[PDB]
UniProtKB/Swiss-Prot annotation, chains A, B:
Keywords: Acyltransferase, Fatty acid biosynthesis, Fatty acid metabolism, Lipid biosynthesis, Lipid metabolism, Transferase. The active site is at A162, H302, H339. InterPro entries: 3-oxoacyl-ACP_synth-2 (IPR017568), Beta-ketoacyl_synthase (IPR000794), Ketoacyl_synth_AS (IPR018201), Ketoacyl_synth_C (IPR014031), Ketoacyl_synth_N (IPR014030), PKS_Beta-ketoAc_synthase_dom (IPR020841), Thiolase-like (IPR016039). Pathway: Lipid metabolism; fatty acid biosynthesis. The keyword Acyltransferase applies. One of its GO terms (cellular component) is cytosol. It comes from Escherichia coli (strain K12). Homodimer. This is 3-oxoacyl-[acyl-carrier-protein] synthase 2. Identified as a drug target. Inhibited by platensimycin and platencin, which are antibiotic produced by various strains of Streptomyces platensis, and by several platensimycin/platencin analogs. Also inhibited by the fungal mycotoxin cerulenin that binds in a hydrophobic pocket formed at the dimer interface. Gene3D superfamilies: 3.40.47.10.
C-alpha cells in the first residue's frame, strides 16, 4: 500500500523562471501575456502569447547540445534539473534503477519541425538536420533528463494534448504505487508559440484575438472571452514513495492522493454543454483519493477561456459539488499564464500544491462580468487566503475528450 | 487481484490489412517492403519503405471526416474498429464509463504537418487548415475511437518513439488491473513514410539504403545490415479483465502477465554495447509476470536491423537467459514488416500473441550470415513450429533509451 508524495518542483512560465517567482506573480495577479516578437505576426489573427522571458540554459545545456533540441525540450530539461536539484536526491548505482520519468508535451518540437521543413522545401532532404527526429519528438525531455541524471527506472511520455501534464504526473504516481519506481520526475513542456502553433490553433478559431490588450485576452468565465491564449513553459515535479522520501528526510510539499481520468466521447475539439466528461474525471479522482467533493478547498480549473470550454467545466463543478458548489474556490491560472498545453497540467499541479503550502488560492484575473447563471466562486481579480484547506484538485482537459484530474493532500 | 486478457485484435501492416492476413504473410516469410511511389524519392538516399497496400476506409470513415485526420489517425481508427468488432463487445450506457483507450504513435501526423507547413509557406497562416492540430496530434486515434464507440473510461496516449506500442498496451493493462477500467483498446499507429519521415531518419544515418533490393534491406543481425526500414501500419488489441471477459464469454487470445520498463540513460539515438537497458526491461517484466527467462519460448525482438541496435539487444538476451540463451527462439518481424515505430510494439504484441495461439514462431528473413559471436536462435529464413510454449515476450525500445517489454501467457 504505497503513498506518493511530492519532493521537488521546477518550472518555467510566462510569469517566472522559478517555482517561487512564478507563484509570487500568480498570487500577485500578474499577467505574462505579451506581444510576439520572434516572427512576423502581421498576417496572424492572434499576435500575442504567454512567452518565457529571457530563457537561459548555458549553465545546463552546452549550446553544442542545444543544437539537438527544440525549445520545448530545452524548457523541459531546465525545469527538470530545477526539480532534481530541489529534491536533493542523489542518484546512485543502487538508485538509478528505481528512479524514472513520465514527461510529455502536447505538440512537441513545432519550432524545429518548421525549420527542418522550411529547410527541405528550400534545399531538399539534404538540409533536413540529422537531429530532426530526436530534437522534436515528444519523449525527448524524458530521454535527455534520464541520461543527464543516470535515471534507469521506468520512462514514459504521455501526449494527451492539454491533459498531458496531469496524465504524466498521475501515471508517474501510479508507476510508483505499483512498485515499478521509487522516484519519478514528471510534468510537461511546450513551446508552441510558433507560426504553426499560432496560425494552427487560430485556424481552428480557438484563440483569443484581443490584440489591443493581450493582458486582458485570457478571461476564463468572463462574458467577453473569445478563445484561449497560448503559453510556453514547463512544469516538473519529483514524485516519490512516502517511506523512501522520509528515510532520506526529503522536503515534502504534499501527497498525491487521487487521480481520475475520463473521456468525453463527444467531439474532437469540444466538450458537451453537459460537462459530463469533466465530472467523471473529477468524480474518479475523488473515489481514488477516497474523499468527497466537500473536502476540496480549491479547484485549479482547466478553464482555458474558450466560450464552450469554460461553461462546460462549470457545469461539471455544480454537478460534482452540488451543495458545496458555491463554497468551493475555483480559479484559472490561465488568466495570467496562458494555455501551456502539454505543460498546463504540470504547472497547475504545482500551483495546486503551493496553494496548500501557503494556504492561498490565486485569482482568475480579467473576470469582469461572469457568465450569467454561475453560482461559483471563480476567485476573481484578487488572490484569496484560505483556512483549513487540506485537499486541492487539479483539472486538465484535452482535445479528443481526454480528461484527467489530480488530488493533492496537505502533508 | 485483477488479471488482464486479450479479447480482440486488429491491424494494418505492410504485409496485410487484417490480423489473419498479416500473420499468414509473416509465417510465410513474406516481405512488405517496397519502393515508395507517393513522393519524389530521387533526392532521397532511401527510396523504399513497408507501405500499407490499397488502404480503404470509406466504409468506416466518411471522406468528409477523413479531411480531418492524418493517415496515421486513419490507419489507427480502421485497426481499432477491427479490434472493437473482433472483441464482440457492446458498449452500453452501463459500460462506456469502464471502457477506455491507450493509443499513441511515435511521430504523428507528419503527412498533414508537411501539407499545412507547405501551405503556410506558400500562402500564409490563412492556408493553415482549421484541422491542423486535431489532425496531426498523437492522441487523436484515441479521441476519434472513444467518440465513435461511446467509450468514456480512461483515455491516454503514450508517445515513446519505437516503444509506444508496448507502453500503451502495458499501461492499458495497468489501468485495468488498477481498477480504473474494465476494457481498453490499445496499440499504436504510424505513417511516417513521408519526406520528413524518410529524409529525417535518413539524415540521422539510421535507415537502410539497399535500394536495389528493398526486400533484402531489413536484415536484423545479419552482418550486412545498414540501418532500419520504415513501415506504416497500426496494431490494436482489446485488453480486458478476466471475469468481465468470461462473464460475457469473449473469445480470449491470451493473458497479459508481465510489463517491464527501463531506461538506457546512455545516448539519445543509441543503446549501450552493453544492452543493459533492454535487460532491465526484460528483467522487470519477468519479475512482473513472476516467471523466469527459461519459460519464455519466443522473444519478438526489437531488432530494427541497425548495426549497434541489433547487437545490443542480443547482449541483453544472453544476459537475461544466459543458459537458456541458445534454447530460446528470438526473431524480428521487422525483417518482413519494416519498422512501424509507434505501432511496432502493438503489431508485435499481436504477433507474440498469435505465436502462442498457433504454437508457431515467424522467421527473421534475410539473416544470411549472422554477426559472429552470436549463440542465439534468431529463427532465420523459415518459420518454426514449437511445442509447449506457454509464454512469449515482446520487446520494444525507443529513442531516449526508453525500453519496455510485455509478457504474454497462453490462455
Ligand atoms: C470545432 C470548434 C468548435 C468551437 C466552438 C466553441 C469554442 O468555444 C471552441 C473555440 C473550443 C471548445 C473547447 O473548449 N475545446 C477544448 C477541449 O474540448 C479540450 C481542451 C481544450 C484546450 O484548449 O485544451 C479546448 O479548447 C471550439 C473549437 C474551435 C471551433 C469553434 O472547436
Ligand atoms: C547518432 C547515431 C549513432 C548511429 C550509430 C549506429 C547505429 O547502428 C544507429 C544507426 C542506430 C543505433 C540504434 O539502434 N538506435 C535506436 C535506439 O537506441 C532505439 C530505438 C531505435 C529504433 O529504431 O526504434 C534505434 O534505432 C545510430 C544512430 C544514427 C547515428 C549512427 O544514432
Amino acid at each position: 500500500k504505497r503513498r506518493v508524495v511530492v519532493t521537488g518542483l521546477g518550472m518555467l512560465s510566462p510569469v517566472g523562471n522559478t517555482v517561487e517567482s512564478t507563484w509570487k506573480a500568480l498570487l500577485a495577479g500578474q499577467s505574462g501575456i505579451s506581444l510576439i516578437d520572434h516572427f512576423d505576426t502581421s498576417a496572424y489573427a492572434t499576435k500575442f502569447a504567454g512567452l518565457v522571458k529571457d530563457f537561459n540554459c548555458e549553465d545546463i545545456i552546452s549550446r553544442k547540445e542545444q543544437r539537438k533540441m527544440d525549445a520545448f525540450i530545452q524548457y523541459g530539461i531546465v525545469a527538470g534539473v530545477q526539480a532534481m536539484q530541489d529534491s536533493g536526491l542523489e542518484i546512485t548505482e543502487e538508485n538509478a534503477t528505481r528512479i524514472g520519468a513520465a514527461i510529455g508535451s502536447g505538440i512537441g518540437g513545432l519550432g524545429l519541425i518548421e525549420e527542418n521543413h522550411t529547410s527541405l522545401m528550400n534545399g531538399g532532404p539534404r538540409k533536413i538536420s540529422p537531429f530532426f527526429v530526436p530534437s522534436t519528438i515528444v519523449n525527448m525531455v524524458a530521454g535527455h533528463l534520464t541520461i543527464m541524471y543516470g535515471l534507469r527506472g521506468p520512462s514514459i511520455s504521455i501526449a494527451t494534448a492539454a491533459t498531458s501534464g496531469v496524465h504524466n504526473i498521475g501515471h508517474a504516481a501510479r508507476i510508483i504505487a505499483y512498485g515499478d519506481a521509487d522516484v519519478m520526475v514528471a510534468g510537461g513542456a511546450e513551446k508552441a508559440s510558433t507560426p504553426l502553433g499560432v496560425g494552427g490553433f487560430g485556424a481552428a478559431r480557438a484563440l483569443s484575438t484581443r490584440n489591443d490588450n493581450p493582458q486582458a485576452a485570457s478571461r476564463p468565465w468572463d462574458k467577453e472571452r473569445d478563445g484561449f491564449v497560448l503559453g510556453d513553459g514547463a512544469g516538473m515535479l519529483v514524485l516519490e514513495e512516502y517511506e523512501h522520501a522520509k528515510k532520506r528526510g526529503a522536503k515534502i510539499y504534499a501527497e498525491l492522493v487521487g487521480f481520475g481520468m475520463s473521456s468525453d466521447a463527444y467531439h474532437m475539439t469540444s466538450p458537451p454543454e453537459n460537462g459530463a466528461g469533466a465530472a467523471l474525471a473529477m468524480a474518479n479522482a475523488l473515489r481514488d483519493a477516497g474523499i468527497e467533493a466537500s473536502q476540496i478547498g480549491y479547484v485549479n480549473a482547466h478553464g482555458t477561456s474558450t466560450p464552450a470550454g469554460d461553461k462546460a467545466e462549470a457545469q461539471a463543478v455544480k454537478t460534482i459539488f452540488g451543495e458545496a458548489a458555491s463554497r468551493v474556490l475555483v480559479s484559472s491560472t490561465k488568466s495570467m499564464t496562458g494555455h501551456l498545453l502539454g505543460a498546463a497540467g504540470a504547472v497547475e499541479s504545482i500551483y495546486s500544491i503551493l496553494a496548500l503550502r501557503d494556504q492561498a488560492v490565486p485569482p482568475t484575473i480579467n473576470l469582469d462580468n461572469p457568465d450569467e447563471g454561475c453560482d461559483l466562486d471563480f476567485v476573481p481579480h484578487e488572490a484569496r487566503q484560505v483556512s483549513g484547506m487540506e485537499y486541492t484538485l487539479c483539472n486538465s482537459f484535452g482535445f479528443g475528450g481526454t480528461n484527467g484530474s489530480l488530488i493533492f493532500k496537505k502533508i
